[PDB]
Symmetry: C2
Subunit: 293 residues, 2 copies
């Protein structure tokens, strides 16, 4: 039983990595591109980009540990720990060539450490819509003159007593719908069917918990990255951010400038956080052209 | 019926003010002091302080509109709208003389506008544990490196779609214990028994909703205060803040210096947000001594 419909020409599969059974969807031929989803979602957020990319690349899109159909990590949820699973997964399919990496939201947190520690293995990098965990995250405001702020959820999700699981259980669809729309400029793309699919997936008790464990490990990730960041990224990099409600705006590129020597960035006016869904065509085009260089 | 036990010698009563029935507890003799509670609680937070103050003052402790046993406001939940009810209540009992004011948390929000607009009515003022709504509240962090973000709940509580009530309904007791203890230094004072009392009160549907309406009105209150603050407070004021986990620390005094000409501040070590309960002895002492500088019974 697949939680989400698989694109024609792709296969849903599993690989054990360090004793953890990871789910992924894979298709295409050529050099490998790994696409890593973020909070609230699964591999399925890439389902529109995948077939287009699969024309020139082997494409793989894993479920993060504990989310979608992937087992929880056996080590833990910090960036460095999760990054190991993702790196070894990619290397199973691209042992002899560097691969490309595209990530969204916490997908960034869970890939950065392996990128910086295995630079020769990464051909090109695309990061979208979330800060790399560092001191900058401590500057975002708790509240704004227009209402709720962008990242107050860091504190809600990091809170102990299983605060988030406990408040959200039984109200999973309701919460996710509000979270998506509060970080979207274009809410229309999210049909009740699509909301249904995402809600049922992260509503799995172990997945609901996994969702927040990534946040409970966020400060540890930050401390991890304070060390890792003494080494700059040397591969070609692109950042993408929404310019509308829910978007990171100029922040995404400006932060990346501190990490990467070779980087370009785009802000998409009229788009929020959920780039692959809110602004699929232009996001798809920028990514494809960047990787096809 | 009473949600919380009245101290010996005090009465639980109600007064209709602009069509809104406010609950209060009152006792003592002499100059009036009004004590105004904050979010998560009711008049009851003052219950250990009240008998002490009542030896020198007439003490009144109202429930904020919609909270405790007080009806919701008919006008709205912004600072200025709510302050009218409390000002008028106080003046019912002290029509011919200024009165003293002690406020905690959103009690501050709900009193500042009547204080600044009726300075002659206010003899002395004590504020503790929350910023006055102004531009400073937009500078608090959403997430911190060490400990926990103090006011991320502003966004939670103010969010659309009745986000907070919808998630918290049926889980009021769980949530309140978390909120209180996560904002406390001395968590041991929050016994399961006391927590049951507070949770039963704010779990009344209209109280749960009212709790969050104060936050939905927060930006409005900030706008109101931008105008009101063009005039500084001239009466003696004191601020208190906890120095431990959940405490505002030096922020309390530093912000107040922008609002008041005559202000002294204290930060209480090893105490968090809930001063009257976590640090009753030194907090009560500070308040009694400060109010007793002015004339009393």
């Amino acid at each position: 039983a697949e939680e989400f419909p698989v694109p024609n020409g792709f296969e849903s599969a599993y690989r054990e990595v360090d004793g953890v059974k990871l789910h992924y969807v894979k298709g295409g031929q050529g050099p490998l591109v790994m696409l890593v989803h973020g909070f609230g979602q699964t591999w399925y957020e890439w389902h529109q980009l995948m077939p287009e990319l699969a024309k020139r690349f082997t494409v793989i899109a894993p479920d993060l540990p504990g989310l979608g159909q992937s087992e929880p990590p056996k080590t833990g949820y910090s960036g460095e720990q999760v990054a190991v699973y993702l790196h070894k997964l990619a290397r199973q399919f691209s042992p002899d060539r560097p691969f490309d990496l595209v990530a969204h939201d916490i997908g960034i947190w869970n890939t950065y450490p392996m990128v910086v520690k295995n630079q020769a293995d990464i051909a090109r990098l695309v990061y979208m819509q979330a800060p790399i965990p560092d001191a900058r995250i401590y500057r975002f405001p708790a509240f704004t003159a227009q209402g709720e702020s962008l990242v107050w959820h860091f504190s809600f999700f990091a809170a102990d007593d299983r605060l988030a699981e406990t408040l959200i259980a039984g109200k999973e669809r309701f919460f996710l719908e509000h979270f998506i729309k509060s970080h979207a400029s274009n809410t229309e793309v999210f049909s009740e069917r699509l909301l249904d699919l995402y809600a049922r997936s992260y509503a799995k008790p172990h997945s609901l918990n996994a969702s927040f464990e990534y946040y409970r490990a966020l400060n540890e990730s930050v401390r991890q990255n304070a060390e890792l960041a003494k080494t700059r990224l040397q591969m070609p990099t692109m950042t993408l951010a929404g310019g509308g409600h829910g978007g990171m705006g100029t922040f995404q590129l400006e932060q990346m400038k501190a990490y990467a020597e070779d980087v370009e960035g785009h802000v998409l006016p009229g788009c929020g956080h959920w780039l692959p869904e809110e602004c699929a065509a232009p996001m798809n085009r920028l990514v494809i052209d960047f990787l096809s260089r």
